[PDB]
Design a protein around this ligand. Structure first.
Ligand SMILES: *[C@@H]1O[C@H](CO)[C@@H](O[C@@H]2O[C@H](CO)[C@@H](O[C@@H]3O[C@H](CO)[C@@H](O)[C@H](O)[C@@H]3O)[C@H](O)[C@H]2NC(C)=O)[C@H](O)[C@H]1NC(C)=O
Ligand SMILES: *[C@@H]1O[C@H](CO)[C@@H](O[C@@H]2O[C@H](CO)[C@@H](O[C@@H]3O[C@H](CO)[C@@H](O)[C@H](O)[C@@H]3O)[C@H](O)[C@H]2NC(C)=O)[C@H](O)[C@H]1NC(C)=O
Ligand SMILES: *[C@@H]1O[C@H](CO)[C@@H](O[C@@H]2O[C@H](CO)[C@@H](O)[C@H](O)[C@H]2NC(C)=O)[C@H](O)[C@H]1NC(C)=O
Ligand SMILES: *[C@@H]1O[C@H](CO)[C@@H](O[C@@H]2O[C@H](CO)[C@@H](O)[C@H](O)[C@H]2NC(C)=O)[C@H](O)[C@H]1NC(C)=O
Ligand SMILES: *[C@@H]1O[C@H](CO)[C@@H](O[C@@H]2O[C@H](CO)[C@@H](O)[C@H](O)[C@H]2NC(C)=O)[C@H](O)[C@H]1NC(C)=O
Ligand SMILES: *[C@@H]1O[C@H](CO)[C@@H](O[C@@H]2O[C@H](CO)[C@@H](O)[C@H](O)[C@H]2NC(C)=O)[C@H](O)[C@H]1NC(C)=O
Ligand SMILES: *[C@@H]1O[C@H](CO)[C@@H](O[C@@H]2O[C@H](CO)[C@@H](O)[C@H](O)[C@H]2NC(C)=O)[C@H](O)[C@H]1NC(C)=O
Ligand SMILES: *[C@@H]1O[C@H](CO)[C@@H](O[C@@H]2O[C@H](CO)[C@@H](O)[C@H](O)[C@H]2NC(C)=O)[C@H](O)[C@H]1NC(C)=O
Ligand SMILES: *[C@@H]1O[C@H](CO)[C@@H](O[C@@H]2O[C@H](CO)[C@@H](O)[C@H](O)[C@H]2NC(C)=O)[C@H](O)[C@H]1NC(C)=O
Ligand SMILES: *[C@@H]1O[C@H](CO)[C@@H](O[C@@H]2O[C@H](CO)[C@@H](O)[C@H](O)[C@H]2NC(C)=O)[C@H](O)[C@H]1NC(C)=O
Ligand SMILES: *[C@@H]1O[C@H](CO)[C@@H](O[C@@H]2O[C@H](CO)[C@@H](O)[C@H](O)[C@H]2NC(C)=O)[C@H](O)[C@H]1NC(C)=O
Ligand SMILES: *[C@@H]1O[C@H](CO)[C@@H](O)[C@H](O)[C@H]1NC(C)=O
Ligand SMILES: *[C@@H]1O[C@H](CO)[C@@H](O)[C@H](O)[C@H]1NC(C)=O
Ligand SMILES: *[C@@H]1O[C@H](CO)[C@@H](O)[C@H](O)[C@H]1NC(C)=O
Ligand SMILES: *[C@@H]1O[C@H](CO)[C@@H](O)[C@H](O)[C@H]1NC(C)=O
Ligand SMILES: *[C@@H]1O[C@H](CO)[C@@H](O)[C@H](O)[C@H]1NC(C)=O
Ligand SMILES: *[C@@H]1O[C@H](CO)[C@@H](O)[C@H](O)[C@H]1NC(C)=O
Ligand SMILES: *[C@@H]1O[C@H](CO)[C@@H](O)[C@H](O)[C@H]1NC(C)=O
Ligand SMILES: *[C@@H]1O[C@H](CO)[C@@H](O)[C@H](O)[C@H]1NC(C)=O
Ligand SMILES: *[C@@H]1O[C@H](CO)[C@@H](O)[C@H](O)[C@H]1NC(C)=O
Ligand SMILES: *[C@@H]1O[C@H](CO)[C@@H](O)[C@H](O)[C@H]1NC(C)=O
Ligand SMILES: *[C@@H]1O[C@H](CO)[C@@H](O)[C@H](O)[C@H]1NC(C)=O
Ligand SMILES: *[C@@H]1O[C@H](CO)[C@@H](O)[C@H](O)[C@H]1NC(C)=O
Ligand SMILES: *[C@@H]1O[C@H](CO)[C@@H](O)[C@H](O)[C@H]1NC(C)=O
Ligand SMILES: *[C@@H]1O[C@H](CO)[C@@H](O)[C@H](O)[C@H]1NC(C)=O
Ligand SMILES: *[C@@H]1O[C@H](CO)[C@@H](O)[C@H](O)[C@H]1NC(C)=O
Ligand SMILES: *[C@@H]1O[C@H](CO)[C@@H](O)[C@H](O)[C@H]1NC(C)=O
Ligand SMILES: *[C@@H]1O[C@H](CO)[C@@H](O)[C@H](O)[C@H]1NC(C)=O
Ligand SMILES: *[C@@H]1O[C@H](CO)[C@@H](O)[C@H](O)[C@H]1NC(C)=O
Lengths: 117, 111, 427, 117, 117, 427
């Protein structure tokens, strides 16, 4: 059901409905199933909470109020969307994940709410 | 189920150089062999993988390639060394086997 | 440009999770998720991924679960503590061949009856490998561990199981012929569940596993380091026919309220030695293939010598074979007797007191099986160790090195569906 | 708390806030409670995931971009909303559920996103 | 990570992204962890269900169609937002929680849906 | 105005949940969540909150879990039922001091060997406190409860654990010097996990706990009600040095297949009495501080008298000290011998048959430890009870009153993030 099969980010961005569904889909082999079901739920909810707080809930593609900081990359969109595998991209900017996520939260709480009320 | 070849036909003077090129629809590492077929004869192997010649093959034949882009350079062309050259994928990325699995070509090299 | 968030991106990273079992027998459990009758396999074009069979935690889970099941299944059974009594015991000589002289003994003893104030005099025929001379004998392990008999209704057949990842996770399979134990491979597919793996327990010769498809595979860590085991996977089976020819009977002896011991009974017909027959020509061709492949790492003109075994206990020096619930310890010599520059009959012994995964502190008693046992298995690979000439011989070790030979193709990964990229749009 | 009590689809469509809430609402009778709580959560999340992927999250009534294919029914809206019990309706078109759901996912991923970005 | 640290409702309403995240964040000390994980999930989902049914999903601040009934308070907004700690406020109107929540559900089901379809 | 819904509001209410353990040893378990190496503590400005250490359910959870662990950890061990046999037994006199006359006895008995049809004659030296005279003796509790020996590889060291709230919950800490057991405090902070608490088990004198920072704290329910215990927390440690001077040996005696009893062996060197040394001047200053603080509730010119103990069993009248896995019952008299208007040597006894949290129906046997034990601990507080002059003396009771002295600072609350307020906006 996975992509990144030579699929560059442009094409890969269109297969999101598949990968988004396979996230949820007292014997030795008894208790283990209960523990495994709980784990699957936990991961699902953590991602949904982030989409919620950033205002991306219900969407596969979410444009936000955070500008791209050039310190995060050394390529043009015309280079990455056409030549890079989603998987390669994620590895290249992995060390900025926590920066972007914090900015995304502020971009909602303040910009779309405290300033809108 | 992998290879395509594009030059179709090339002409050269004796002592000159020509090149031909093949592409793979799927990445196949360095798993591309090359053949020389003279008219009326069974084909001869020139190249094992992208960078390796078979013993007995003149040093004027050489090549390289990886992933999906592969080429063959034939230098110091000898008079009447006319042949059709071909590419073969030696790796099947779908089944995992490593054997001739798809073949194609056509170069009409004339000298 | 602006940050755009994408959800459901096809991205994965290495991960360790527990796995689900999918599929009365001791391992089958009969509490696994029914498998998918039409399972999917999804090919990943242009994906190269790195696998390492020696660091694969799926091996550790198979090992831990099978041991836990062994005890969960055999724990609620009759204990044989009352049999740790001085036995009076002499040799069985009534109708035996030469090969069996001293192999069986007729032991008798004073044991507890249904009432605790009464004793009964009973007898059982024991294999030599289960007793210790103190005409007075002790059972093996009465000075080391408690002995519990296995429940007679429990099957030991190696019924296959499948491992399945939880949602949010996936298992990647390396579909690559000629792929060794480690490194990247260009052919990967995604599955949710593994192929069925039979929990076969053996030493020296791997039985009823998967075959290699193009060439005999030699997989080891290092190779040049002779402290490591070499796992050799055949691309063709070698058929081996094992038998226990004596027609046995058994007795049920009450050892107190609610419990009974399964004693061996009398033997019907003459007494002969257990043995295994390996087709000879097939075996000779199979090793020739192993040798041609071994030379790739040792030299084209290097002599490859095969020796029988190192010194050690039965669990090391003989082939360990479990079939019908009977436990065999076969000679395995004559199969490995050459330099490389009909059938082979392997004499085989039988033992009832078993110390297996838990080497000390626990023992299990294999009850007798009435009648005659005939068992046919596929030799699918070897466990070899290495010592101008290289010398190889059958090895052994913990079961993890045998089970990893069926899991070398799999890796567990986690899916990380949420991530970002710059785009020409904005909120 | 259940409807379909002679309530035709028209009237039944108005009671959705009740039925939508009763979906979430090592001894022998110990471990069983833990297992039961996990099951209740699992069912809740599966329905929420479908509403999310179809763009129906947060709504009780959701109009979509999928046209009704007449091969799915033999009645007018004027006949079913007034004469059929919600329960009867669900049984009558039960064999088309998987068709409609696949169409609903495409109607979002492509029509509301890949074509809007 | 908690507020109400002298923070009146005005200021407190701006720290919601922090408190909203710490809601999700067979040995004696084995089975207890499994039970505890299930509890944390259960509480998270109950609050999300209420936000969903009231049409407040995805938001930290949600204005609704329910008018404030003066029987619920004895203060002006100019008094409570500036002088009261969020915590004090919640205690003062705690006995009206169930009234407000029922009104909020009707304010969606009927006013934003049955009347919009 | 209109109703506006807010989510993530900083509101909490009192709650009871189970707590997570964060951190081979009997209590450590080694199945706890690794702690946060950089834990956060968040101060709450202008927050006053009410705490009550006597009604704190965290105390009950510590008690329940530690008892359950005690059994989960020691249950799978060798039973000593075969030792409930008439013993023939006489006094050890070969090389003893006067203080030890009658303290140790040399017992011998007929016990089961690896084989059930054979007996062996063995001996062990027992402490007087473990036997009952019927030269014929019975072990204590063979007429009351089953005795199981503790597994020799299990450590009894009081390794600290941390309690952590589940997501959706938090623990509030009262950071307030001079805060007594109950009431509001103006200094509160939020933590997710508690400080590490050592599961130290003792009576009369609390060992290796936290110290008070400004003054000796006297915490009790009521104070004037003399039926309640007074927990006195020192703001300085008093160092106490305990020893078991005899060099012991031990024997492993098989009691049947798979099991062995740890018997005591012979004693190397002369036999002396176990004892504890409390620095004298330090102890005298420490009590003077306790007295000055006690007077605040009893009168500035009220005489405060300290007595040794009430009558009762060892668990009441002596100090209970568990160190090295050995169990000591110390005299604790002379420490409490004054009216208030070098070192103190406390003779101490040793007992191997332990009845602790489960007072009846179960007993544990503490195996001997070879060599000599030296143990140094911090006295951090006292358990006192009260009787012109007030009289106080060492008390005791269930462990809950000792463990609550480390949890008086914590309360569990739940977070209620969803609520409403009137605003000038509308949908
Ligand atoms: C390798 O695979 C083969 C094929 O599955 C295994 O052979 C099978 O062994 C079982 C157990 O001994 C046989 O079942 C028994 O059959 C008799 C009737 O003949 C019945 O009375 C017993 O109650 C039991 O059901 C089974 O027939 C046999 N299969 C075949 C085709 O002969 C073999 O055991 C595996 N090798 C190892 C080491 O596990
Ligand atoms: C109060 O805290 C002190 C300090 O942690 C505790 O003292 C420690 O006690 C343990 C157990 O007796 C000692 O460990 C042993 O050390 C010997 C080597 O000398 C080793 O052979 C044993 O196997 C074991 O590891 C530890 O050294 C000792 N620490 C110090 C600094 O002396 C004391 O037990 C605590 N008090 C109470 C009542 O728990
Ligand atoms: C794997 O990579 C190759 C290129 O290295 C991709 O092949 C090209 O795909 C484009 C469409 O995106 C075609 O227009 C080209 O003609 C293809 N090249 C050749 C030689 O055929 C291939 O599509 C990638 N695999 C996947 C699944 O995307
Ligand atoms: C020994 O190996 C043979 C050959 O692989 C196995 O027989 C095949 O079994 C598959 C089903 O798994 C059939 O589809 C093939 O047609 C069979 N081939 C032949 C030649 O019979 C055989 O089952 C293996 N034996 C054991 C015990 O595993
Ligand atoms: C192991 O047993 C098989 C049968 O189960 C033997 O193969 C059979 O041999 C006879 C001739 O004696 C043939 O008629 C059968 O058709 C063969 N059966 C099969 C399935 O091949 C096999 O030879 C025995 N192996 C050894 C080493 O003794
Ligand atoms: C490996 O083979 C050698 C050679 O046969 C074994 O050595 C002796 O073999 C004879 C039979 O030919 C026996 O009678 C001797 O008792 C064997 N010697 C010893 C010391 O046992 C050798 O033992 C074999 N090794 C193994 C593990 O089977
Ligand atoms: C059960 O079915 C009956 C009809 O078969 C319904 O009765 C009618 O309801 C309508 C309102 O929808 C009234 O205007 C009619 O006057 C009623 N008929 C009679 C004879 O009184 C009844 O409402 C259904 N039950 C429920 C709960 O909907
Ligand atoms: C705790 O309460 C005090 C007032 O009782 C708050 O102090 C005032 O805060 C405002 C800002 O909101 C300042 O303009 C005033 O000058 C402060 N007063 C003084 C005397 O300095 C204090 O901010 C509250 N604590 C918190 C965290 O909000
Ligand atoms: C007895 O109390 C002393 C004093 O509090 C403890 O020693 C301190 O330990 C901390 C670490 O927890 C260090 O940071 C201090 O520097 C130490 N102070 C001194 C003077 O050494 C001692 O560890 C306590 N002993 C026991 C068994 O708890
Ligand atoms: C308890 O033992 C400690 C040592 O572990 C004793 O303190 C030491 O005393 C010597 C002098 O005899 C000094 O040289 C050391 O520097 C001291 N060590 C420390 C850490 O202070 C202590 O006196 C003993 N207590 C009692 C009551 O005997
Ligand atoms: C508390 O101290 C008193 C006074 O010493 C103890 O009473 C007697 O003390 C003498 C030694 O001076 C002993 O020989 C007597 O046997 C003690 N009397 C009794 C009835 O035992 C008193 O026992 C001490 N109490 C405790 C619990 O230790
Ligand atoms: C074993 O001994 C019994 C007598 O106790 C005898 O009846 C039986 O035949 C003997 N069995 C064998 C195999 O010698
Ligand atoms: C039993 O076997 C031993 C070992 O081979 C032999 O010495 C003894 O004589 C045998 N006893 C009988 C009765 O054959
Ligand atoms: C049973 O006990 C008697 C006791 O007199 C003994 O003589 C006999 O040898 C024992 N028999 C067996 C088989 O152990
Ligand atoms: C049991 O006896 C055998 C006799 O050969 C000895 O080697 C073994 O060590 C003994 N077991 C134990 C636990 O001492
Ligand atoms: C497996 O193949 C890789 C190259 O793909 C090689 O580097 C590695 O050494 C091989 N493994 C062994 C054990 O030789
Ligand atoms: C092994 O071969 C012999 C003949 O050499 C035959 O008598 C025997 O029955 C065979 N055993 C098996 C298990 O096939
Ligand atoms: C295997 O059989 C040979 C006889 O050929 C014997 O000498 C050897 O000791 C036996 N090995 C084992 C491990 O039983
Ligand atoms: C190994 O081969 C020799 C002949 O070279 C033979 O005499 C010997 O018995 C064979 N060894 C085995 C274990 O079959
Ligand atoms: C086995 O291989 C050897 C060479 O290593 C050869 O001499 C022998 O004849 C072969 N035997 C069979 C049955 O093929
Ligand atoms: C205990 O008695 C045994 C004899 O049974 C003797 O050898 C040993 O020395 C005695 N031990 C002591 C401490 O008296
Ligand atoms: C053993 O101790 C008792 C109690 O003190 C005493 O009466 C008896 O005489 C002592 N026995 C010996 C041998 O000293
Ligand atoms: C052991 O049993 C015999 C039975 O005759 C008895 O005389 C002896 O005193 C017992 N010994 C012990 C130490 O109990
Ligand atoms: C065991 O014996 C002692 C003798 O002092 C007695 O006090 C105790 O009550 C007895 N235990 C039981 C359970 O009767
Ligand atoms: C603790 O302090 C409060 C005042 O803050 C006081 O009312 C209460 O009585 C004190 N507790 C005790 C046991 O005296
Ligand atoms: C206690 O003090 C005495 C001297 O009065 C000394 O001999 C003994 O060793 C000390 N004991 C401990 C545990 O420090
Ligand atoms: C403590 O020691 C004294 C001697 O000073 C003794 O009289 C008293 O009985 C002992 N108390 C306890 C509880 O052992
Ligand atoms: C208490 O003090 C007196 C002296 O006033 C002394 O004789 C007595 O032994 C002391 N008690 C203890 C238990 O040390
Ligand atoms: C302990 O305090 C008393 C007064 O209560 C005093 O008389 C005595 O001298 C003090 N002893 C020490 C060592 O300070």
């Amino acid at each position: 059901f996975l992509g990144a099969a030579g699929s560059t980010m442009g094409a890969a961005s269109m297969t999101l409905t598949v990968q988004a569904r396979n996230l949820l889909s007292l014997t030795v082999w008894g208790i283990k199933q209960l523990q495994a079901r709980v784990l699957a739920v936990e991961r699902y909810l953590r991602d949904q909470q982030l989409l919620g707080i950033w205002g991306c809930s219900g969407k596969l593609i979410c444009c936000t109020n955070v500008p791209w900081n050039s310190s995060w990359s050394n390529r043009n969109l015309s280079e990455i969307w056409d030549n890079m595998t989603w998987l390669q991209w994620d590895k290249e900017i992995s060390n900025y994940t926590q920066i972007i996520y914090g900015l995304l939260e502020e971009s909602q709480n303040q910009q779309e709410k405290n300033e809108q009320d | 189920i992998v290879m395509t070849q594009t030059p179709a036909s090339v002409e050269a003077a004796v002592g000159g150089t020509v090149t031909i090129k093949c592409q793979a629809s799927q990445r196949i590492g360095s798993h591309v062999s090359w053949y020389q077929q003279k008219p009326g004869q069974r084909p001869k192997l020139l190249i094992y993988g992208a960078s390796n010649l078979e013993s007995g093959v003149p040093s004027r034949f050489s090549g390289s390639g990886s992933g999906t882009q592969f080429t063959l350079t034939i230098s110091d062309l000898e008079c009447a060394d006319a042949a059709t050259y071909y590419c073969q994928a030696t790796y099947d990325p779908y089944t995992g086997g490593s054997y001739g699995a798809g073949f194609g070509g056509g170069t009409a090299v004339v000298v | 440009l602006w940050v755009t968030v994408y959800y459901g991106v096809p991205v994965w990273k290495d991960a360790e999770t527990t796995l689900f079992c999918a599929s009365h027998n001791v391992w089958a459990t009969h509490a696994c998720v029914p498998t998918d009758p039409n399972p999917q396999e999804i090919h990943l074009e242009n994906v190269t991924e790195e696998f390492n069979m020696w660091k694969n935690n799926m091996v550790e889970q198979m090992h831990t679960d099978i041991i836990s099941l062994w005890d969960q299944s055999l724990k609620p059974c009759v204990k044989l503590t009352p049999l740790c009594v001085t036995l009076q015991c002499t040799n069985v000589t009534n109708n035996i061949t030469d090969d069996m002289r001293g192999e069986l003994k007729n032991c008798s003893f004073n044991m507890t009856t249904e009432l605790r104030d009464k004793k009964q005099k009973v007898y059982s025929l024991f294999y030599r490998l289960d007793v210790v001379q103190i005409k007075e004998y002790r059972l093996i392990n009465c000075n080391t561990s408690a002995i519990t008999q296995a429940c007679p209704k429990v099957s030991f057949e190696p019924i296959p199981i499948h491992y399945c990842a939880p949602a949010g996770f996936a298992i990647l399979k390396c579909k690559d012929k000629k792929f060794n134990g480690t490194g990247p491979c260009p052919s990967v597919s995604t599955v949710q569940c593994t192929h069925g793996i039979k929990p076969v327990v053996s030493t020296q010769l791997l039985l009823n596993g998967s075959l290699a498809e193009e060439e005999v595979m030699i997989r080891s860590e290092n190779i040049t380091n002779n402290a490591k085991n070499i796992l050799v996977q055949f691309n063709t089976p070698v058929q081996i026919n094992c038998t226990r020819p004596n027609n046995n009977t058994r007795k049920s002896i009450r050892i107190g309220p609610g419990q009974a011991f399964y004693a061996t009974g009398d033997i019907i017909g003459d007494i002969r030695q257990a043995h295994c027959n390996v087709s000879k020509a097939t075996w000779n061709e199979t090793l020739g293939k192993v040798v041609k492949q071994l030379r790739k790492h040792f030299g084209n003109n290097t002599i490859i010598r095969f020796a029988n075994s190192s010194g050690g206990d039965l669990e090391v020096t003989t082939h360990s074979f479990n079939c019908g619930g009977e436990f065999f310890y076969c000679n395995t010599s004559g199969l490995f007797n050459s330099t490389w520059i009909d059938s082979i009959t392997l004499p085989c012994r039988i033992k009832q007191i078993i110390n297996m995964w838990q080497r000390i502190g626990q023992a299990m008693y294999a009850p007798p099986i009435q009648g005659v046992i005939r068992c046919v298995s596929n030799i699918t690979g070897l466990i070899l160790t290495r010592d101008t000439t290289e010398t190889f011989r059958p090895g052994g070790g913990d079961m993890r090195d045998n089970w990893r030979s069926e899991l070398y193709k799999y890796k567990v990964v986690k899916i990380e569906p949420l991530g970002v990229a710059p785009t020409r749009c904005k909120r």
